[PDB]
């Protein structure tokens, strides 16, 4: 009834970590602010034409 458990795949020795997350996005203790989404880019070299 209280805790959501996320299992760390690549743990080295062993541990458990407990934290808090309120409804407001400021009740985190760590902020992930994506300034720009994943921007795709493409180009070519006009001597081999191979897509990059």
């Amino acid at each position: 009834g209280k805790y959501r458990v996320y299992i760390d795949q690549y743990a080295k020795q062993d541990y458990f970590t407990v934290g808090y997350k309120g409804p407001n996005e400021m009740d985190a203790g760590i902020y992930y602010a994506p300034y720009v989404a994943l921007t795709p880019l493409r180009g070519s070299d006009p001597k081999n034409f191979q897509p990059v």
Binding site: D8, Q9, E25, A28, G29, Y31, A33, P34, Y35
Partner: protein, 52 residues
């Protein structure tokens, strides 16, 4: 006299269909392709986002 023989159990000969007998085989039959499964994520909701 018109014996089948077999490949020399070498991956090189097996792939190419070369046999020690009379008839040269077409080649191995494809059974499908195997690849790694994309790893999952931690649902990213343990920390607030607040995009910039």
């Amino acid at each position: 006299a018109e014996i089948g023989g077999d490949h020399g159990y070498n991956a090189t000969n097996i792939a190419a269909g070369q046999t020690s007998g009379a008839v040269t085989q077409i080649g191995p039959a494809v059974m499908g392709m195997v690849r790694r499964a994309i790893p999952n994520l931690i649902a990213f909701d343990i920390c607030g986002v607040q995009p910039m």
